[PDB]
Amino acid sequence: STLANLTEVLFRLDFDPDTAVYHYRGQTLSRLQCRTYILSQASQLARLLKPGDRVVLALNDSPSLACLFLACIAVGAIPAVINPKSREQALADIAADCQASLVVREADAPSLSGPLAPLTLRAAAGRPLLDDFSLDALVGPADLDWSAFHRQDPAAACFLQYTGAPKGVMHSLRNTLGFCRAFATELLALQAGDRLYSIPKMFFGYGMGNSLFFPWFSGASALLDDTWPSPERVLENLVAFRPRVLFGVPAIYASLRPQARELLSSVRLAFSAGSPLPRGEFEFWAAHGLEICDGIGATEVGHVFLANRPGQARADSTGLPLPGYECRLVDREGHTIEEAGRQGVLLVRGPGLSPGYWRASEEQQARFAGGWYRTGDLFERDESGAYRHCGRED
Numbered sequence: 001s002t003l004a005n006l007t008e009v010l011f012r013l014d015f016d017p018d019t020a021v022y023h024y025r026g027q028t029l030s031r032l033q034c035r036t037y038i039l040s041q042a043s044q045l046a047r048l049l050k051p052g053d054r055v056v057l058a059l060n061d062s063p064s065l066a067c068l069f070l071a072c073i074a075v076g077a078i079p080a081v082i083n084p085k086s087r088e089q090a091l092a093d094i095a096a097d098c099q100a101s102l103v104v105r106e107a108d109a110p111s112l113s114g115p116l117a118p119l120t121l122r123a124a125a126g127r128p129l130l131d132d133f134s135l136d137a138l139v140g141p142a143d144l145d146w147s148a149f150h151r152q153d154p155a156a157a158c159f160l161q162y163t164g165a166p167k168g169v170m171h172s173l174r175n176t177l178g179f180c181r182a183f184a185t186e187l188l189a190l191q192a193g194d195r196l197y198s199i200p201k202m203f204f205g206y207g208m209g210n211s212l213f214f215p216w217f218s219g220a221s222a223l224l225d226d227t228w229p230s231p232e233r234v235l236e237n238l239v240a241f242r243p244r245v246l247f248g249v250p251a252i253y254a255s256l257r258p259q260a261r262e263l264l265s266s267v268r269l270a271f272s273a274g275s276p277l278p279r280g281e282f283e284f285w286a287a288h289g290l291e292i293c294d295g296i297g298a299t300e301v302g303h304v305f306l307a308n309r310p311g312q313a314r315a316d317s318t319g320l321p322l323p324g325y326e327c328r329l330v331d332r333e334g335h336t337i338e339e340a341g342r343q344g345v346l347l348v349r350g351p352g353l354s355p356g357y358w359r360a361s362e363e364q365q366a367r368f369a370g371g372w373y374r375t376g377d378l379f380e381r382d383e384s385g386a387y388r389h390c391g392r393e394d
Protein backbone atom coordinates (compact mmCIF):
# COMPACT_ATOMS: atom_id res chain seq x y z
CA SER A 1 0.00 0.00 0.00
CA THR A 2 1.09 3.57 -0.71
CA LEU A 3 2.19 5.73 2.20
CA ALA A 4 -0.40 8.44 2.80
CA ASN A 5 -1.61 11.08 5.25
CA LEU A 6 -5.25 11.45 6.31
CA THR A 7 -5.24 15.26 6.27
CA GLU A 8 -3.58 15.32 2.84
CA VAL A 9 -6.16 12.81 1.56
CA LEU A 10 -9.07 14.91 2.83
CA PHE A 11 -7.56 18.02 1.21
CA ARG A 12 -7.35 16.23 -2.15
CA LEU A 13 -11.07 15.34 -2.23
CA ASP A 14 -12.78 17.03 -5.18
CA PHE A 15 -15.02 19.69 -3.64
CA ASP A 16 -15.20 23.42 -4.32
CA PRO A 17 -12.60 25.12 -2.06
CA ASP A 18 -14.77 28.24 -1.71
CA THR A 19 -17.67 26.38 -0.07
CA ALA A 20 -18.23 26.46 3.68
CA VAL A 21 -16.85 23.71 5.90
CA TYR A 22 -17.34 25.02 9.45
CA HIS A 23 -19.60 27.60 11.10
CA TYR A 24 -18.87 29.18 14.47
CA ARG A 25 -20.30 32.12 16.43
CA GLY A 26 -22.18 33.45 13.42
CA GLN A 27 -19.12 33.19 11.17
CA THR A 28 -18.21 30.80 8.36
CA LEU A 29 -14.92 29.33 7.16
CA SER A 30 -14.44 27.84 3.71
CA ARG A 31 -12.52 24.68 2.85
CA LEU A 32 -9.75 26.89 1.46
CA GLN A 33 -9.59 29.07 4.59
CA CYS A 34 -9.25 26.03 6.84
CA ARG A 35 -6.73 24.29 4.57
CA THR A 36 -4.54 27.39 4.50
CA TYR A 37 -4.68 27.71 8.28
CA ILE A 38 -4.09 23.98 8.86
CA LEU A 39 -0.95 24.01 6.71
CA SER A 40 0.32 27.15 8.46
CA GLN A 41 -0.32 25.61 11.87
CA ALA A 42 1.27 22.34 10.76
CA SER A 43 4.47 24.24 9.94
CA GLN A 44 4.56 25.37 13.58
CA LEU A 45 3.65 21.98 15.08
CA ALA A 46 6.46 20.35 13.08
CA ARG A 47 8.93 22.51 15.04
CA LEU A 48 7.52 21.10 18.29
CA LEU A 49 6.48 17.49 17.59
CA LYS A 50 8.19 14.57 15.92
CA PRO A 51 6.22 12.01 13.90
CA GLY A 52 4.31 9.71 16.22
CA ASP A 53 4.14 12.08 19.20
CA ARG A 54 0.75 12.01 20.91
CA VAL A 55 -1.33 15.13 21.58
CA VAL A 56 -4.36 15.52 23.88
CA LEU A 57 -6.82 18.29 23.00
CA ALA A 58 -9.05 19.21 25.96
CA LEU A 59 -11.08 21.86 24.16
CA ASN A 60 -14.67 22.84 23.43
CA ASP A 61 -15.95 22.36 19.88
CA SER A 62 -14.62 25.08 17.57
CA PRO A 63 -13.02 25.42 14.13
CA SER A 64 -9.65 25.89 15.84
CA LEU A 65 -10.04 22.52 17.55
CA ALA A 66 -10.96 20.79 14.29
CA CYS A 67 -8.09 22.45 12.41
CA LEU A 68 -5.56 21.79 15.19
CA PHE A 69 -6.55 18.12 15.15
CA LEU A 70 -5.93 17.92 11.39
CA ALA A 71 -2.70 19.92 11.68
CA CYS A 72 -1.45 17.39 14.23
CA ILE A 73 -2.25 14.58 11.81
CA ALA A 74 -0.57 16.52 9.00
CA VAL A 75 2.79 16.41 10.82
CA GLY A 76 2.42 12.77 11.85
CA ALA A 77 1.37 13.47 15.42
CA ILE A 78 -1.42 11.39 16.94
CA PRO A 79 -4.16 13.54 18.52
CA ALA A 80 -7.05 12.69 20.82
CA VAL A 81 -9.97 14.97 21.71
CA ILE A 82 -11.34 14.74 25.26
CA ASN A 83 -13.92 16.53 27.40
CA PRO A 84 -12.58 20.04 28.13
CA LYS A 85 -14.29 19.83 31.53
CA SER A 86 -12.54 16.58 32.50
CA ARG A 87 -11.35 16.49 36.10
CA GLU A 88 -7.61 16.98 36.47
CA GLN A 89 -6.96 13.33 37.40
CA ALA A 90 -8.95 12.07 34.41
CA LEU A 91 -6.97 14.27 32.02
CA ALA A 92 -3.72 13.15 33.66
CA ASP A 93 -4.67 9.48 33.30
CA ILE A 94 -5.40 9.85 29.58
CA ALA A 95 -2.23 11.87 28.96
CA ALA A 96 -0.22 9.20 30.80
CA ASP A 97 -1.89 6.30 28.99
CA CYS A 98 -0.94 7.64 25.55
CA GLN A 99 2.32 9.21 26.81
CA ALA A 100 1.30 12.56 25.33
CA SER A 101 3.98 15.09 24.45
CA LEU A 102 1.52 17.98 24.35
CA VAL A 103 -1.84 18.91 25.84
CA VAL A 104 -3.82 21.90 24.56
CA ARG A 105 -6.37 23.29 27.00
CA GLU A 106 -8.86 26.08 27.53
CA ALA A 107 -7.62 29.50 28.56
CA ASP A 108 -6.56 29.74 32.22
CA ALA A 109 -6.42 25.94 32.58
CA PRO A 110 -3.85 24.51 35.03
CA SER A 111 -0.64 22.86 33.92
CA LEU A 112 -0.31 19.08 33.89
CA SER A 113 2.10 17.63 36.45
CA GLY A 114 3.51 14.31 37.55
CA PRO A 115 5.79 11.79 35.86
CA LEU A 116 6.51 12.74 32.24
CA ALA A 117 3.87 15.45 32.32
CA PRO A 118 3.19 16.87 28.83
CA LEU A 119 3.77 20.44 27.74
CA THR A 120 0.54 22.39 28.34
CA LEU A 121 -0.56 25.10 25.91
CA ARG A 122 -3.71 27.20 26.14
CA ALA A 123 -6.29 28.59 23.76
CA ALA A 124 -6.70 32.36 23.68
CA ALA A 125 -9.34 34.18 25.64
CA GLY A 126 -12.07 35.78 23.59
CA ARG A 127 -12.88 32.68 21.51
CA PRO A 128 -11.37 33.87 18.20
CA LEU A 129 -12.47 32.31 14.94
CA LEU A 130 -8.92 30.97 14.47
CA ASP A 131 -6.56 30.45 17.40
CA ASP A 132 -2.79 29.98 17.36
CA PHE A 133 -2.75 28.31 20.80
CA SER A 134 0.34 30.40 21.67
CA LEU A 135 2.35 28.77 18.86
CA ASP A 136 3.31 32.14 17.35
CA ALA A 137 5.05 33.11 20.60
CA LEU A 138 6.44 29.63 21.32
CA VAL A 139 7.93 28.62 17.96
CA GLY A 140 7.59 31.75 15.80
CA PRO A 141 5.28 32.64 12.91
CA ALA A 142 4.22 30.01 10.41
CA ASP A 143 5.82 29.11 7.10
CA LEU A 144 3.99 30.44 4.05
CA ASP A 145 3.69 27.38 1.78
CA TRP A 146 4.06 24.32 3.98
CA SER A 147 3.29 20.88 2.59
CA ALA A 148 5.62 18.50 4.46
CA PHE A 149 2.98 15.90 5.26
CA HIS A 150 4.13 12.85 7.19
CA ARG A 151 3.03 9.88 5.10
CA GLN A 152 2.67 6.43 6.65
CA ASP A 153 1.04 3.06 6.15
CA PRO A 154 -2.74 3.60 5.84
CA ALA A 155 -3.33 0.92 8.49
CA ALA A 156 -1.14 2.61 11.12
CA ALA A 157 -2.54 4.64 14.00
CA CYS A 158 -3.10 8.28 13.23
CA PHE A 159 -5.45 9.43 15.99
CA LEU A 160 -6.98 8.08 19.20
CA GLN A 161 -10.47 8.12 20.69
CA TYR A 162 -10.94 7.59 24.42
CA THR A 163 -14.53 6.62 25.24
CA GLY A 164 -12.28 1.95 34.20
CA ALA A 165 -8.68 2.86 33.50
CA PRO A 166 -8.86 4.84 30.23
CA LYS A 167 -8.58 2.91 26.96
CA GLY A 168 -7.47 4.64 23.76
CA VAL A 169 -8.96 3.28 20.55
CA MET A 170 -6.58 3.58 17.60
CA HIS A 171 -7.97 4.83 14.31
CA SER A 172 -6.08 4.65 11.02
CA LEU A 173 -6.41 6.42 7.69
CA ARG A 174 -7.93 3.29 6.16
CA ASN A 175 -10.62 2.59 8.75
CA THR A 176 -11.49 6.30 9.09
CA LEU A 177 -12.20 6.59 5.38
CA GLY A 178 -14.01 3.28 5.84
CA PHE A 179 -16.44 4.50 8.48
CA CYS A 180 -16.96 7.79 6.62
CA ARG A 181 -17.85 6.08 3.33
CA ALA A 182 -20.22 3.58 4.94
CA PHE A 183 -22.15 6.20 6.92
CA ALA A 184 -21.76 9.58 5.20
CA THR A 185 -21.90 8.26 1.63
CA GLU A 186 -23.78 4.96 1.62
CA LEU A 187 -26.29 5.44 4.44
CA LEU A 188 -26.93 9.20 4.51
CA ALA A 189 -25.78 10.18 1.00
CA LEU A 190 -24.65 13.58 2.22
CA GLN A 191 -24.56 16.16 -0.56
CA ALA A 192 -22.14 19.00 -1.14
CA GLY A 193 -23.44 22.09 0.63
CA ASP A 194 -25.51 20.20 3.22
CA ARG A 195 -25.63 22.06 6.54
CA LEU A 196 -24.99 19.65 9.44
CA TYR A 197 -25.55 20.15 13.17
CA SER A 198 -24.36 17.55 15.69
CA ILE A 199 -25.42 18.26 19.25
CA PRO A 200 -22.88 15.73 20.62
CA LYS A 201 -19.37 17.18 20.78
CA MET A 202 -16.14 16.09 19.12
CA PHE A 203 -14.79 14.35 22.25
CA PHE A 204 -17.49 11.75 21.52
CA GLY A 205 -16.67 9.57 18.52
CA TYR A 206 -20.19 10.16 17.20
CA GLY A 207 -19.62 13.92 17.21
CA MET A 208 -16.08 13.65 15.85
CA GLY A 209 -17.41 11.94 12.74
CA ASN A 210 -20.45 14.20 12.44
CA SER A 211 -18.69 17.55 12.89
CA LEU A 212 -14.98 17.10 12.22
CA PHE A 213 -14.75 14.59 9.36
CA PHE A 214 -18.01 14.53 7.38
CA PRO A 215 -17.73 18.19 6.25
CA TRP A 216 -14.36 17.44 4.62
CA PHE A 217 -15.41 14.01 3.43
CA SER A 218 -18.74 14.93 1.80
CA GLY A 219 -18.37 18.63 0.98
CA ALA A 220 -20.86 19.58 3.69
CA SER A 221 -20.52 22.10 6.50
CA ALA A 222 -21.03 21.75 10.23
CA LEU A 223 -22.08 24.15 12.98
CA LEU A 224 -19.54 24.05 15.82
CA ASP A 225 -20.51 25.41 19.24
CA ASP A 226 -18.21 25.65 22.25
CA THR A 227 -21.02 26.10 24.80
CA TRP A 228 -22.95 23.30 26.41
CA PRO A 229 -26.13 22.17 24.60
CA SER A 230 -28.95 23.36 26.80
CA PRO A 231 -32.29 23.01 24.97
CA GLU A 232 -32.34 26.82 24.89
CA ARG A 233 -28.99 26.95 23.09
CA VAL A 234 -29.93 24.12 20.71
CA LEU A 235 -33.02 26.13 19.76
CA GLU A 236 -30.98 29.28 19.22
CA ASN A 237 -28.66 27.32 16.91
CA LEU A 238 -31.55 25.73 15.01
CA VAL A 239 -33.16 29.10 14.30
CA ALA A 240 -29.88 30.79 13.40
CA PHE A 241 -28.26 28.01 11.34
CA ARG A 242 -31.27 26.09 9.94
CA PRO A 243 -29.45 22.76 9.48
CA ARG A 244 -30.68 20.18 6.99
CA VAL A 245 -29.12 17.25 8.90
CA LEU A 246 -29.42 16.91 12.68
CA PHE A 247 -27.38 14.41 14.73
CA GLY A 248 -28.97 13.82 18.13
CA VAL A 249 -29.63 11.18 20.79
CA PRO A 250 -33.01 10.04 22.16
CA ALA A 251 -33.23 12.43 25.12
CA ILE A 252 -32.41 15.37 22.83
CA TYR A 253 -35.35 14.56 20.57
CA ALA A 254 -37.57 14.31 23.63
CA SER A 255 -36.37 17.75 24.73
CA LEU A 256 -37.08 19.24 21.27
CA ARG A 257 -40.78 18.26 21.23
CA PRO A 258 -42.02 21.78 22.18
CA GLN A 259 -40.00 23.18 19.25
CA ALA A 260 -41.17 20.69 16.62
CA ARG A 261 -42.38 23.43 14.28
CA GLU A 262 -39.00 25.21 14.35
CA LEU A 263 -37.10 21.96 13.84
CA LEU A 264 -39.32 21.00 10.89
CA SER A 265 -38.53 24.36 9.27
CA SER A 266 -35.16 23.07 8.04
CA VAL A 267 -34.35 19.54 9.22
CA ARG A 268 -34.85 16.89 6.54
CA LEU A 269 -32.56 14.13 7.89
CA ALA A 270 -32.74 13.47 11.65
CA PHE A 271 -30.39 10.88 13.13
CA SER A 272 -30.24 9.42 16.64
CA ALA A 273 -27.49 7.30 18.22
CA GLY A 274 -26.05 6.50 21.65
CA SER A 275 -28.95 4.49 23.07
CA PRO A 276 -32.16 3.00 21.66
CA LEU A 277 -34.68 5.46 20.26
CA PRO A 278 -38.04 4.71 21.95
CA ARG A 279 -41.08 4.00 19.79
CA GLY A 280 -42.86 6.88 21.51
CA GLU A 281 -40.20 9.29 20.31
CA PHE A 282 -40.16 7.92 16.75
CA GLU A 283 -43.95 8.19 16.60
CA PHE A 284 -44.23 11.69 18.10
CA TRP A 285 -41.92 13.01 15.39
CA ALA A 286 -43.49 10.96 12.60
CA ALA A 287 -46.77 12.72 13.42
CA HIS A 288 -45.01 16.02 12.62
CA GLY A 289 -43.62 14.57 9.39
CA LEU A 290 -40.07 13.88 10.62
CA GLU A 291 -38.42 10.47 10.36
CA ILE A 292 -35.78 9.81 13.03
CA CYS A 293 -33.20 7.21 12.01
CA ASP A 294 -31.82 5.18 14.92
CA GLY A 295 -28.37 3.65 14.46
CA ILE A 296 -25.70 2.14 16.70
CA GLY A 297 -22.03 3.04 16.63
CA ALA A 298 -19.13 2.30 18.94
CA THR A 299 -15.74 3.93 19.38
CA GLU A 300 -14.01 0.65 18.44
CA VAL A 301 -15.91 0.67 15.10
CA GLY A 302 -15.26 4.30 14.17
CA HIS A 303 -18.88 5.33 13.70
CA VAL A 304 -22.38 3.99 12.99
CA PHE A 305 -22.29 0.47 11.57
CA LEU A 306 -25.93 -0.69 11.90
CA ALA A 307 -28.83 1.68 11.36
CA ASN A 308 -32.24 2.49 10.00
CA ARG A 309 -31.98 3.78 6.43
CA PRO A 310 -33.47 7.19 5.52
CA GLY A 311 -36.93 6.74 4.05
CA GLN A 312 -37.23 3.21 5.48
CA ALA A 313 -36.90 3.64 9.26
CA ARG A 314 -39.03 1.64 11.69
CA ALA A 315 -39.93 2.21 15.32
CA ASP A 316 -38.29 0.11 18.05
CA SER A 317 -35.50 -1.08 15.76
CA THR A 318 -31.81 -0.42 15.08
CA GLY A 319 -32.11 -1.39 11.41
CA LEU A 320 -29.61 -3.18 9.16
CA PRO A 321 -25.81 -3.47 8.96
CA LEU A 322 -24.32 -0.75 6.78
CA PRO A 323 -22.71 -1.65 3.44
CA GLY A 324 -19.38 -3.36 4.05
CA TYR A 325 -20.19 -4.42 7.62
CA GLU A 326 -21.11 -7.92 8.75
CA CYS A 327 -22.97 -8.48 12.03
CA ARG A 328 -23.33 -11.72 13.96
CA LEU A 329 -25.10 -12.79 17.14
CA VAL A 330 -23.51 -15.40 19.42
CA ASP A 331 -25.15 -17.38 22.22
CA ARG A 332 -23.62 -17.91 25.67
CA GLU A 333 -21.42 -20.74 24.33
CA GLY A 334 -20.06 -18.62 21.46
CA HIS A 335 -22.21 -20.29 18.80
CA THR A 336 -23.68 -18.26 15.94
CA ILE A 337 -27.42 -17.62 16.23
CA GLU A 338 -29.31 -18.09 12.96
CA GLU A 339 -32.87 -17.90 14.28
CA ALA A 340 -34.93 -14.73 14.43
CA GLY A 341 -36.25 -13.57 17.78
CA ARG A 342 -33.30 -15.02 19.72
CA GLN A 343 -31.01 -12.64 21.54
CA GLY A 344 -27.23 -12.92 21.66
CA VAL A 345 -24.16 -10.74 21.88
CA LEU A 346 -23.52 -8.66 18.77
CA LEU A 347 -20.15 -8.93 17.02
CA VAL A 348 -19.27 -6.70 14.06
CA ARG A 349 -16.57 -6.51 11.38
CA GLY A 350 -16.14 -4.09 8.50
CA PRO A 351 -14.58 -0.94 7.12
CA GLY A 352 -14.64 1.16 10.29
CA LEU A 353 -13.16 -1.43 12.66
CA SER A 354 -10.27 -0.11 14.73
CA PRO A 355 -6.95 -2.01 14.59
CA GLY A 356 -6.94 -2.10 18.41
CA TYR A 357 -6.28 -0.23 21.65
CA TRP A 358 -3.18 1.95 21.99
CA ARG A 359 -2.18 0.51 25.38
CA ALA A 360 -4.00 -2.46 26.83
CA SER A 361 -3.68 -5.84 28.46
CA GLU A 362 -4.19 -8.95 26.35
CA GLU A 363 -7.62 -9.37 27.97
CA GLN A 364 -8.65 -5.86 26.93
CA GLN A 365 -7.40 -6.46 23.38
CA ALA A 366 -9.46 -9.67 23.29
CA ARG A 367 -12.50 -7.52 22.51
CA PHE A 368 -10.99 -7.49 19.00
CA ALA A 369 -10.38 -11.25 18.89
CA GLY A 370 -10.72 -12.88 15.49
CA GLY A 371 -11.12 -9.71 13.42
CA TRP A 372 -14.45 -8.81 15.05
CA TYR A 373 -15.36 -6.30 17.73
CA ARG A 374 -17.44 -7.76 20.57
CA THR A 375 -19.90 -5.00 21.42
CA GLY A 376 -21.16 -6.43 24.70
CA ASP A 377 -24.67 -5.54 23.52
CA LEU A 378 -27.49 -8.05 23.43
CA PHE A 379 -29.46 -7.90 20.18
CA GLU A 380 -32.06 -9.93 18.33
CA ARG A 381 -32.79 -10.10 14.61
CA ASP A 382 -36.25 -10.29 13.04
CA GLU A 383 -37.24 -12.23 9.92
CA SER A 384 -36.48 -9.19 7.74
CA GLY A 385 -32.88 -9.10 9.01
CA ALA A 386 -33.36 -6.00 11.17
CA TYR A 387 -31.83 -5.73 14.63
CA ARG A 388 -33.28 -4.62 17.98
CA HIS A 389 -31.25 -3.85 21.10
CA CYS A 390 -32.06 -6.03 24.13
CA GLY A 391 -29.58 -4.97 26.84
CA ARG A 392 -25.99 -5.67 27.85
CA GLU A 393 -24.31 -9.00 28.46
CA ASP A 394 -23.07 -9.88 31.94
Ligand SMILES: Nc1ccccc1C(=O)OP(=O)(O)OC[C@H]1O[C@@H](n2cnc3c(N)ncnc32)[C@H](O)[C@@H]1O
Nearest residue numbers: 205206273274275276295296297298299303304389
Ligand atom coordinates in the same frame (compact mmCIF):
# COMPACT_ATOMS: atom_id res chain seq x y z
N1 LIG B 1 -18.68 6.15 19.07
C1 LIG B 1 -19.91 6.25 18.44
C2 LIG B 1 -19.96 6.67 17.11
C3 LIG B 1 -21.17 6.84 16.45
C4 LIG B 1 -22.35 6.59 17.11
C5 LIG B 1 -22.34 6.17 18.43
C6 LIG B 1 -21.13 5.99 19.11
C7 LIG B 1 -21.16 5.50 20.52
O1 LIG B 1 -22.15 5.47 21.21
O2 LIG B 1 -19.93 5.05 20.97
P1 LIG B 1 -19.49 4.54 22.47
O3 LIG B 1 -18.26 3.74 22.30
O4 LIG B 1 -19.45 5.74 23.42
O5 LIG B 1 -20.67 3.61 22.95
C8 LIG B 1 -21.04 2.45 22.19
C9 LIG B 1 -22.16 1.75 22.93
O6 LIG B 1 -23.29 2.63 23.06
C10 LIG B 1 -24.49 1.90 22.92
N2 LIG B 1 -25.21 2.39 21.75
C11 LIG B 1 -24.79 3.34 20.85
N3 LIG B 1 -25.68 3.64 19.94
C12 LIG B 1 -26.77 2.83 20.26
C13 LIG B 1 -28.05 2.69 19.69
N4 LIG B 1 -28.48 3.42 18.66
N5 LIG B 1 -28.88 1.78 20.24
C14 LIG B 1 -28.46 1.08 21.30
N6 LIG B 1 -27.29 1.14 21.94
C15 LIG B 1 -26.48 2.04 21.36
C16 LIG B 1 -24.11 0.42 22.83
O7 LIG B 1 -24.10 -0.12 24.15
C17 LIG B 1 -22.71 0.51 22.24
O8 LIG B 1 -21.90 -0.62 22.52
